[model samples]
Target chain A: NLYFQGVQHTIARWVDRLREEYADAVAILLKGSYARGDAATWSDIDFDVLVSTQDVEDYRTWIEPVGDRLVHISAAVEWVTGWERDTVDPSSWSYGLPTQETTRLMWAINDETRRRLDRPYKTHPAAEPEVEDTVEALGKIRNAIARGDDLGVYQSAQTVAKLVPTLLIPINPPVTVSHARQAIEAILAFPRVPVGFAADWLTCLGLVEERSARSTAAAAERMVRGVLEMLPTDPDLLGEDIARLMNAGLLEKYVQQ
Target chain B: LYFQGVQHTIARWVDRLREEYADAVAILLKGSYARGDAATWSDIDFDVLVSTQDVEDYRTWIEPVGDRLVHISAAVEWVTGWERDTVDPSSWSYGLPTQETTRLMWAINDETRRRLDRPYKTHPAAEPEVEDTVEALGKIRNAIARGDDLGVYQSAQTVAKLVPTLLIPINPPVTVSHARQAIEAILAFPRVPVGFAADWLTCLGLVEERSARSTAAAAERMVRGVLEMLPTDPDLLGEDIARLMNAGLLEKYVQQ
Candidate 1:
């Protein structure tokens, strides 16, 4: 297929372009549809261009063209320490490129930062603050729906949809963008899970109309409540307050109808 | 009496809330209604500040606020807030209004002297890449010119995906959710080629299923509309056009 050859050529050219143009680039990663090998013809290409913190601005403006398809560029940090100490939301991290490939990309870097690339993806256990933040976001959607603000409902729903993957991944590992459909299937497989998870998620993705805003909001609340219930309460993993909050029915209080 | 009509509607609801709950200490108007820029389609937004001790009671009365708002022929939103020691009261809560309204509400507290600010900052628009997007735009135009209805329709759809790649930052950026929202947001920005939205929506399936020739004709009109609005600068426009095309994208969709 032309799409296959086109993307392959595009990726090769892009890698060369980066190597030639930015000597400061520490690592280059191929992620999303292409890396996962499940891309449709229309799938957009996603890349992670890792550079020094000082070099972030310079790399930010760089663009790579690949035929007539869309290319998504994420200018990220090169070192493992940079990722670990990064205060930005982990949801902001690009995914699909696995550990081994990332290590290969970091061949030019020093051993320490290169080794850090060995584990390219990070997963965190569900914590209280994380749960509360999700609940708060869901509440905003509910409020927006009540006011008949379609854009507000749309915007807040999208925010929660982005958050759902992060919350779900902790329960089932490796729920990246490439594996989202599988992840949704995994969530639906669980007993006592909200039946409307799929529909609500579709609404959040803007694939379907939010014809029944109240129903959608209720469904989202139900799904979040289900995830919070299943989360482990081990003090070692979630800290005391987070564990207490989950165990002592704090989430229940927040989602009460 | 347009402004009077809005204030009257807001006052009736506030009066009822105060009568029912002694703890309803403050009522702050927000959004377009408060900003004095409301269109006829705008809904009312109100923030009810209550004493910490009576938050439970006030929340119990929230459902009734919605009910009473219907009588006044206005759609209303009521969120409850209490004092906190934090620098930003907004960070302590979660809901739709977010940071922008907090600044607006603060301006109310300061007797309108506090300057209003934008909720988010606009990044410098990046330069266009090579001619990929431009090429795609041209392909759509050519398809339209040749009366190739299917080609025109298909190519116009491709432009949607490419538009965002050029528009959004390489890092975290606010992505427009769907076609309709994208149309609205794009129109807000300056220098967009005209008639881009109507054509885009048609390609997204607004046009009815019909003869290939009709679809082709519609698609061609849409493509022509975008071309008409684009900047005349040859160098800048090509780069802008190039930003829309991708290699992996072509084989996958066109084959289907």
Candidate 2:
């Protein structure tokens, strides 16, 4: 029980301290592994302090004083306005669905204030450019392997594994490293799962030691090819059908074979 | 001039591009078209070579080449050096048509080509670890025959994982994901099992409502189909498979 209670108490104390110390702060919410109730000893405590756009710069200066624990603080005005309005760019806010836990305000100005500002969690389709960017990242993994850059190969492989879910599913950012397994589970549950789903992800994560660097690269190649095959021949139609299928919860039903 | 309908169309466009842009250096055909195995549904890809100075000018003429069926979709400077020559990243401009044509592979200079060809020319074929791969396949067959649903399902998926070990030993080894491509490539034709892709998912237990019996049957059909197509000589096959396995390239899905 100490394992569970220690971090919860620390998080609670920090929340209280942030509220008392930074009264100007709009809200403070627990994030990352702990917020999702999936924290491990190795996990860092993450907190997002919502402040006004003007106060963002000022808050960053003194925000770290509130926590002695190894913590990551994301102090942003965008936290208050929601990513969509704050960034003024639709693509920036389009990575994933907002989580209920992310909006669970530990310390808000008031209930009305939290209700008015907190955006509802909705799954958004991945933009075509976003998909292309991910595909480009996948290409880098292959390039790294071809050159025999071990570290590059390892990192790029992990990068593709981590990014594939965001490209395929709709989930909000701080796409926790833990979300990869969850995304794969969701994909496996689908009517038509992508080919080599388990093999590719495991290989990319370097879990399949039976596979060589070449074999691992080959697995990644196939996964990328599979995703590429799903795209429409016409770039314009790429996101259109995908959006429709995902929105209808029928992505597995209509994906190209 | 008429190799085929799509090929002719591609050739005509290449001529047009050469004529319009005097700076056009070389044009290469690639993808399924280059491999001389274009399907009824194949798309055209073309590689265009131009001087560094005229690269920008060549891109401007891509729109005129567009027709109802085909349009230039992507054009990027080729990486000449590829992995070897770290200096020049620019090589050729690859163009993908909106419709079926050719899939431009990449651009390469004469020196790079010469240097690259040497590696493929003399590399020794590595043998596969036949004992484990064959043992895994046997397990699948046994499970199916015994009416062990869970065993059949597990072993069938294991067979799919081991299938690539055999494939990666060919003259040009195929990757895990390119199992279909490798089979087709080795056969030198489009013919493969109709249920190949579907059976793979079934073997993985991703197919819903499919009985274990049905999935095992599908897996058996796929494995047998692939094995039937490979060279009969165990030595030839074993060498390549073992090479991949020894290199740690062959993945074993069933740990035991």
Candidate 3:
């Protein structure tokens, strides 16, 4: 009953505007979280802007201006098959060239990308994004709290708050704090799921904590402040930062409190 | 204004039905709207079963019952008999038939009627008890997907066990009657498009050569399809059902 039909209208309007403004681009599509029907209020509007090889360089500068002309919803952009990987070493192992092709440009919302972004990453073993970790981790923490494991509850909440911040990647404009909260909440409320798990997840994401004797407003505020402090300066590097911060003792200040 | 209008329209229609059709037994509204979750867009579903031998005599008078509510839309459907897989379009187009009774209504056991007929003193949200029904449907679908007839038969037995509890509330008290009513409603105003249902059912082998095989694959497919049709929203279940209907997978089965 929460109406999202307005988003579609905005998307249609943007599609026309983008096509007119960026004629060299091959195709523009609405994809990801919205396309998959799992988008939440905080989800970023994602778009795949495809470009021809000749016009690929032009696309690099045009991404932000084109998105600006489209709508008010904050967005990030991904361009497909445009440039080659830069080489540093002359060793036997070689970094692969990245292409600027129209066919490989898959558009989708952030959560939708997390669900379908299973292709190998640029590095060896090519790690793809995983959304389930948050889902499962939240479940574990909620269970611990429900069983009254005060220590377990505190620790899980602490860990999630430390780990989740690094996962935010900005495609063009950075992800808003409000959008992050919305995305985290949706993952928690997925059908047949318990509310406690999401409650703790919200805690880790620095949104809300459990509301009880154990769930102090002061503690929640402190945890949120700690997480915000650890956020990566560059939104594009959120995933890498999250992986780096998970065991990096980033939340020691809050944990000690 | 809209809520008051709906309430007035429903009351007037029931009153008209009582006066115009002598054979009319009772008219009832079910689900969220019936329980006071009504909105401007909610379709007022009415169950009208005739006691007369000439069912058409009652059908002719049914349409005029709500004719006074000219501003709001109305549809009427009629049924002659009950069959598990019956498909009749005309009954649904007019609102004389409905899919909820056909596919899931339970007979008005003493307990159920008490819940329905009792004066509403409070607005209580009842938790859905459809898990057993969903699980039964799931098993049937899994069996069909595996191409196991014996498994299919066993699942059907489980389905049969729940059939009475699922369909007895409507005026006509039989599983076949409910199925016919469901098919007619589905054919006329199916939640899911008929084409999608046709494709999905074919994939699960529910409908083969224009008839239902009731095979294990068909049952499993139906269950999975139902799950797939569930919307992403959690607090609102009816909206999700509406989405499923729009997708063309669900239909009202019509039987007399």
Candidate 4:
């Protein structure tokens, strides 16, 4: 249980180093499985560091020894607050919802940093439509799989495996947990869903005996179609299209069945 | 001693690969190390082919040989059918080589020499069969419009890679892999594009005050200046820049 037990000491040591090294290092927020308190022994520590965008590499170089994979996101103080939330300009909602939903607890940091966290850790609280983003996410998943850049199929398959949370977000499911395994467990418990969806999506990570790119892609396409059909219909949204989409075994195949 | 030592390390590496796979039939080497023009910082770029039954993730690794740590692309495969593919102009299928595949194996299907192991057999380099950068251009331009810094930076790196193969014919050089040695090789080539290093540096985040806006502009500059140097017709040139209209090109090009 190194994930939860005795983790803060190491976490604190990591945080302490950053606070000492860079006055520009604004805040350190622990995220992912470690933050959720459910990480297995093999799970690497995951985190996000708030600093000026100009000197990100400086902070990353200090922490590189931990083997944490760092991505180059523009999350400086000005960048984060100045940006729109999942609401306003939702052109990039695929990345937007997670920023709104995830838990990002601060470590030993300044009072000014705490004030910034006052409203929400991050939110664009304005007129944002209740939109179903999972429907649009299918386009991106298909685009990468179709290109099949040699063994890049391996990368695309992993991307498909990670989309479980993306599917969960639309229904307003519990978005508190920061780990995929926990998210998968949450989806498995959903009262209504297409028959065998959990099994089918797991198969997208690896499909058929040979599991070539084409075979894997076909599985993804089928599951995507089934979700769009099985999703709860809204009177304002689907209208009478729900009647046309209705198949004999639809509602009967829910968990109650 | 340095060159000769890597030669021995290469031999040991190939033998180990042969042991791991059921039949490690073909092994090939390219990059600065293969062509005998290696600089002090050059890393090994190579590939392995097999007929074993397996599937796994792709990776990059830091390996040590002859008492020195070296960065290398460890892209391996068991796509045996591609070993001798006869696909028409090209195919990016499981059984055939694609542009992103680190080692070029197009000639492996027929005319290219069978360099199974050590002794570093040098042969004429293979040209990429398909042009796939238009999709890449679409990715960067979309990133620029959306204010996605990470997306713009990531896609621009891919564009820098395609420059050697898609737009320019590299001279006195080996294949390009976006490493220190490889980038230096392309820049050394005579008559490279006007925006080559300047834009490429910004694209890499080596330049200060880097913004997603600057990165996107830098990416287009690298592709734009290089595309004009090639013997291209205006109609086709307009098509290339259609996805990249904001890079400031010809009158016919428009942002799509």
Task: Residues B199-248, candidate 2: write the lDDT tens digits.
Answer: 65455443324565676677657665665455545355444443443443
Instruction: Report every candidate's CA lDDT.
Output: 0.45, 0.45, 0.36, 0.44
Q: Candidate 4: which pairs clash?
A: B82-B95
Q: How many backbone clashes does candidate 3 have?
A: 72
Predicted complexes: DockQ each: 0.06, 0.02, 0.01, 0.02
Error of 4 at A85 (Å): 6.1
lDDT of predicted model 4: 0.44
Taking the tens digit of each residue's C-alpha lDDT, what string does model 3 give over B115-233?
Answer: 33522212112222123344455445545566544334444434433322222222242121222233333333234322434433233222212222434344444444443444433
Candidate 4: segments with Cα more than 4 A from true spot = A1-7, A39-47, A52-112, A118-176, A207-225, A231-257, B1-256
Model 4 chain A poorest 10 in a row by lDDT: A70-79
Ranking by TM-score: 1, 2, 4, 3
Q: Residue B89 error for model 1, in Å?
A: 20
* Best of the two (1, 2) by TM-score: 1
Alpha-carbon shift of residue A57 in model 4 (angstroms): 7.5
Worst ten in a row by lDDT for model 2 chain A: A58-67
What lDDT tens digits, residue by residue, belong to model 1 across residues A1-257?
A: 67578777777677766656567666666655576665553344555566665625322312344566544333333543454444233332221111222212423356765666545444432222244446546766666666775555555555566466545554555333323333334444434334567666645533342235555566566667766777767655444545665576543543563
TM-score of the second chain for every model: 0.35, 0.37, 0.29, 0.47
Best by lDDT: 2
lDDT of 3: 0.36
If both were scored by DockQ, which would come out higher, candidate 2 or candidate 3?
2
